[PDB]
Amino acid sequence: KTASTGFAELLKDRREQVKMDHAALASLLGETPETVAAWENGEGGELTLTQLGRIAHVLGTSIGALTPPAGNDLDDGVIIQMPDERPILKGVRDNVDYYVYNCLVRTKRAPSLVPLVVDVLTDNPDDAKFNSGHAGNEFLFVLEGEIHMKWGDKENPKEALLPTGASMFVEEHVPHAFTAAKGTGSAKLIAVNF
Amino acid sequence: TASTGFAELLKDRREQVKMDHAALASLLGETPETVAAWENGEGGELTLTQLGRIAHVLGTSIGALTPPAGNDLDDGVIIQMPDERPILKGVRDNVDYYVYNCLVRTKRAPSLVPLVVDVLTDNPDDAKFNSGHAGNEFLFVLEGEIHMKWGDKENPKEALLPTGASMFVEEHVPHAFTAAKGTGSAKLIAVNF
Amino acid sequence: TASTGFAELLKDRREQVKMDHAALASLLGETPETVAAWENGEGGELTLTQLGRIAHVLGTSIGALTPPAGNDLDDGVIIQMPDERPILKGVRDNVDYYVYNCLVRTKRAPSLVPLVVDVLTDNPDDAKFNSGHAGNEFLFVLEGEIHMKWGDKENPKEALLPTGASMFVEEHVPHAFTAAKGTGSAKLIAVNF
Amino acid sequence: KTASTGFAELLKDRREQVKMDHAALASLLGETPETVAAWENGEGGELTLTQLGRIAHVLGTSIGALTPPAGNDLDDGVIIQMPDERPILKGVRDNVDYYVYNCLVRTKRAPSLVPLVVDVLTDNPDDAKFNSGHAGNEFLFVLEGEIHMKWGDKENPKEALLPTGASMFVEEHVPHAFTAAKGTGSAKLIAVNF
Numbered sequence: 105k106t107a108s109t110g111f112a113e114l115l116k117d118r119r120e121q122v123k124m125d126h127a128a129l130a131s132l133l134g135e136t137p138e139t140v141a142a143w144e145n146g147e148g149g150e151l152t153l154t155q156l157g158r159i160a161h162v163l164g165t166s167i168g169a170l171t172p173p174a175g176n177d178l179d180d181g182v183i184i185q186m187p188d189e190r191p192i193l194k195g196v197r198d199n200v201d202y203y204v205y206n207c208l209v210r211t212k213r214a215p216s217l218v219p220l221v222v223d224v225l226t227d228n229p230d231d232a233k234f235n236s237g238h239a240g241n242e243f244l245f246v247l248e249g250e251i252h253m254k255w256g257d258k259e260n261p262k263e264a265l266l267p268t269g270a271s272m273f274v275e276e277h278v279p280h281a282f283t284a285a286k287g288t289g290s291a292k293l294i295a296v297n298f
Numbered sequence: 299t300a301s302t303g304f305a306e307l308l309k310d311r312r313e314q315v316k317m318d319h320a321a322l323a324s325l326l327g328e329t330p331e332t333v334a335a336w337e338n339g340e341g342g343e344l345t346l347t348q349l350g351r352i353a354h355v356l357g358t359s360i361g362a363l364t365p366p367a368g369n370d371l372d373d374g375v376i377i378q379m380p381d382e383r384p385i386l387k388g389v390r391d392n393v394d395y396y397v398y399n400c401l402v403r404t405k406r407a408p409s410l411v412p413l414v415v416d417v418l419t420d421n422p423d424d425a426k427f428n429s430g431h432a433g434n435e436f437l438f439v440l441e442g443e444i445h446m447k448w449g450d451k452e453n454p455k456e457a458l459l460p461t462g463a464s465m466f467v468e469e470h471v472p473h474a475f476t477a478a479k480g481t482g483s484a485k486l487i488a489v490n491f
Numbered sequence: 492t493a494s495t496g497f498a499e500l501l502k503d504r505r506e507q508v509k510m511d512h513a514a515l516a517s518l519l520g521e522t523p524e525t526v527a528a529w530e531n532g533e534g535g536e537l538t539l540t541q542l543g544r545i546a547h548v549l550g551t552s553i554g555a556l557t558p559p560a561g562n563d564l565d566d567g568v569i570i571q572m573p574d575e576r577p578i579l580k581g582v583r584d585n586v587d588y589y590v591y592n593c594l595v596r597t598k599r600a601p602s603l604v605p606l607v608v609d610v611l612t613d614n615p616d617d618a619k620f621n622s623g624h625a626g627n628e629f630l631f632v633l634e635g636e637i638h639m640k641w642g643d644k645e646n647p648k649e650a651l652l653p654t655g656a657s658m659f660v661e662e663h664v665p666h667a668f669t670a671a672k673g674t675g676s677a678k679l680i681a682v683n684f
Numbered sequence: 685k686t687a688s689t690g691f692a693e694l695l696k697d698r699r700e701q702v703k704m705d706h707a708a709l710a711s712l713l714g715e716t717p718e719t720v721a722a723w724e725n726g727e728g729g730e731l732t733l734t735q736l737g738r739i740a741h742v743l744g745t746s747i748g749a750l751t752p753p754a755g756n757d758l759d760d761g762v763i764i765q766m767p768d769e770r771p772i773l774k775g776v777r778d779n780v781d782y783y784v785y786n787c788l789v790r791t792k793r794a795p796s797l798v799p800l801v802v803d804v805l806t807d808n809p810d811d812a813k814f815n816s817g818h819a820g821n822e823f824l825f826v827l828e829g830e831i832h833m834k835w836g837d838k839e840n841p842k843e844a845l846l847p848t849g850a851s852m853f854v855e856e857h858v859p860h861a862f863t864a865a866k867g868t869g870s871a872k873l874i875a876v877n878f
C-alpha cells in the first residue's frame with residue numbers, strides 16, 4: 105500500500121475511531137472539510153512531515169499509526185539475493201578503516217533483519233572501536249580467522265577470543281567491538297541483526 | 299519535534315543498514331548535505347510521498363522513522379471534567395441513532411476511546427449495525443434498558459440489558475444497540491481499547 | 492486441553508530446535524516413550540517444577556509451551572447481568588476503604604478488569620495510596636464527587652472530580668481516592684486494561 | 685526466576701489484579717485459603733499441568749501469564765558458543781537422511797533464535813522433502829556448494845538455484861525444502877531462525 109493511499113485509509117479509520125466527522129477534524133487543522141475528504145480520497149501526498157505531526161496530534165496518536173507498514177517485497181513468502189548483487193560499504197571508525205560490509209538479503213516484511221558478511225581489516229585489539237549498541241539483537245558466526253571480541257563498558261569491557269566456527273549472541277543496546285586476534289591479520293564474520 | 303524525532307530515527311536506521319550520508323543520498327537522488335540536514339532536524343517540509351521513498355530505500359516504514367505519539371499526562375494522569383467532553387451525532391442511513399459524548403483520551407494510550415452514548419431510538423426492529431471495528435470494546439448500561447444485537451445481522455444474537463449490565467465485544471464483531479422496545483431512550487458507557 | 496495444547500506446543504518447540512524424542516528425553520533423564528506420551532497428550536500430571544526443566548532444556552518459557560487463555564465468548568460477545576457481579580471488600584491498614592463490584596471479564600482479553608467501586612470514606616486526609624499497578628486504568632465518576640490523589644504520596648497531585656468526570660491513570664502510577672470532604676460516599680467505574 | 689518462585693509472584697499479582705482474596709480463589713479450586721497462601725510463598729512446585737490450567741482458568745487468563753519468562757543466560761548481555769561444543773542431530777525425512785544439523789548458540793533471552801549450519805547430503809531435487817513451515821522467519825546463506833531450493837505448494841512449488849554466497853529470507857509458516865543442485869553432491873547452509 106502506497107504512502108498516500110495507505111494514509112487515506114488509516115486517516116479515515118482513525119477519524120471514525122474518535123467519532124469525528126470531516127468538519128470537526130478540519131476545524132483543528134486550518135483546512136476545510138472538503139480538504140480533509142480529499143486526503144481520505146488519497147490526495148494527501150504533499151502533506152509535510154510537520155503537517156502529518158499535527159494531524160497525528162489532534163487525533164491523539166502517532167504518524168506511524170496513520171501510515172502503512174513497510175510493504176511486501178516477497179515472492180510467495182520468499183526473497184533471494186544473488187552473491188554479486190550484494191551491497192558493500194566501508195565501516196570507518198576513528199578516521200581509520202575498520203570493517204568492509206557485504207550486505208546480504210533484506211526484506212520490508214521484517215525490517216529489523218540486517219544480515220552482513222563483515223571483513224575485519226585490523227588485528228590490533230587496542231584499535232577496537234566500540235559502537236553504541238544496536239536496536240535489535242545480533243547473532244554472529246566466525247566465518248574465517250580469529251576474532252577478538254569486546255563488549256559492555258568500553259572503559260572496562262568483557263573480552264573473548266573466538267576461533268573460526270564460534271557463534272555469539274549480543275543483546276540489543278549492548279555496546280561491542282570487533283578485531284582479528286592480535287597479529288593474526290584479518291578475520292571474517294557473518295553478522296545477523298534481527 | 300516530528301522533525302526532531304525523524305532526524306534521530308533516520309540517523310539510527312541509516313546506521314543500522316550501514317549507509318553513510320552519500321550512500322543514502324544517491325538512492326534518493328539528493329546530495330549528502332541534504333541528508334545531513336534532515337538528520338540535523340531540517341526535514342520538516344518533506345512530503346508524505348518523499349517520506350515514503352525514504353522509508354522504502356531504508357527497507358522500513360514511515361512509522362519506524364517517526365516518533366511515538368507523545369506524552370500529554372501530568373505525572374501519569376490526565377483528567378477531563380464533564381461539559382468539556384466532545385459531542386458528535388451518530389447518523390446511520392439518515393437517522394440520529396446515537397449521540398457520542400467523548401470522555402478523556404491520551405496519546406500515551408491512543409486506542410483508548412471512552413464515550414457516554416445516548417441511545418436515541420427504542421425500536422429494536424429498526425436497529426442499525428456497524429460492521430464491527432478494530433479493537434475490543436467494554437460497555438456498561440448507565441441508564442435505561444438496552445436491546446443489543448450482534449453477529450450476523452440477518453440472524454443476530456441478542457440480549458436485553460438492564461442498567462448496571464456490562465458487556466465485552468471483541469474486535470471485528472458487528473453490533474447494534476437501541477433502547478428496549480418502547481422505553482424511549484437509554485445510555486451506555488462504551489470504552490474502546 | 493492444558494495437556495492437549497502442551498502436547499502440541501512441545502512437539503513444535505522440540506522440532507524447532509531439531510531434537511527427536513531420544514535427544515530430548517536424554518536431557519530430561521526420561522525415556523523417549525515418555526516424551527512421546529507427552530506429545531500424545533499424556534502430560535497432565537507433570538509438575539510446575541518439571542515443566543520448568545522441560546522449558547529450560549528447550550531454551551524457552553513454560554508459557555511458550557502452554558496454550559492461550561481460551562475463548563469464553565458467544566459469537567464474539569460476553570455479557571454480565573447486574574447482581575451476578577463479584578463483590579469483595581478493599582481493606583487498607585484495617586479500614587474498609589473500597590467495595591469492589593466486579594463487572595464482566597473475558598479470557599480473550601485477560602488484562603480487562605472493569606469494576607464499579609464504592610468509595611466509602613470521605614476524608615481526603617485519610618486517603619490510602621496503592622503503590623500503582625501494572626496496566627492502564629480508565630475511570631469515570633458514576634455518583635457523588637471524588638477527591639483523587641496521585642504521584643508522590645508525600646506531595647501528591649490532586650483533583651476534585653464531580654459526577655461525569657473521567658480520568659486515565661498510567662501503569663505504575665500510585666493513586667488513592669475518597670469521596671470529597673464530608674460528602675459521605677461516591678462511586679466510580681474503574682476499567683483496568 | 686525459578687518456576688515456583690516466579691509462579692508465586694505472578695499468582696499473587698493476578699489474584700490481586702482481579703480483586704480476589706485467598707478465600708475467594710481457594711473456593712474455586714478445591715483448596716483451603718492456607719494452601720493458596722502457601723503457593724504464593726513459593727510452595728506450588730508440585731502443582732500439575734492440569735491443576736495450573738484450572739488455576740489460570742478461574743483467574744481468567746493463561747498458564748503463561750502466571751509463569752516466569754525463560755530466563756537470563758547471558759554474560760552482561762552476551763553468550764558465546766565455541767565450535768566444538770556445537771550440538772549435532774540427524775535430520776531424516778522419509779526414512780532417508782536429508783540434513784546434518786550443527787547447532788549454533790542459543791539464548792533464553794531470545795528463544796526464537798535457532799541458528800544452525802546444515803550439511804545438505806542429497807543432490808537429487810526430486811528427493812526434496814518439504815517441511816510444514818516454521819513459526820518464525822528464517823534467514824539463510826549458502827556457505828558451500830549450490831542449493832536447489834523449493835517453496836510454497838509442495839505440489840506446485842516455486843524453485844530457485846542458489847550458488848555459494850547467495851542469501852534468502854523465508855517468511856514464517858511458508859513450507860520449503862532444500863537439496864544440493866542436481867548431481868553436485870552436497871552443499872552447506874547457515875540457517876538462522878528468528
Ligand SMILES: C[C@@H](O)CP(=O)(O)O
Binds near residue numbers: 235282293
Ligand atoms: C560486526 C558488527 O556487529 C559490527 P557493528 O555493526 O555492530 O558496529
Ligand SMILES: C[C@@H](O)CP(=O)(O)O
Binds near residue numbers: 415428475486
Ligand atoms: C455503542 C458503540 O459500540 C456503537 P459503535 O461506535 O461501535 O458503532
Ligand SMILES: C[C@@H](O)CP(=O)(O)O
Binds near residue numbers: 624628679
Ligand atoms: C479505583 C482503583 O483504581 C483503586 P485500586 O484498585 O487500583 O487500588
Ligand SMILES: C[C@@H](O)CP(=O)(O)O
Binds near residue numbers: 802822873
Ligand atoms: C535449512 C532448514 O531450513 C531446513 P528445515 O529445518 O526448515 O526443514
Ligand SMILES: [Co+2]
Binds near residue numbers: 238242280295
Ligand atoms: Co553489532
Ligand SMILES: [Co+2]
Binds near residue numbers: 431435473
Ligand atoms: Co462498538
Ligand SMILES: [Co+2]
Binds near residue numbers: 624628666
Ligand atoms: Co487503580
Ligand SMILES: [Co+2]
Binds near residue numbers: 818822860875
Ligand atoms: Co527452514
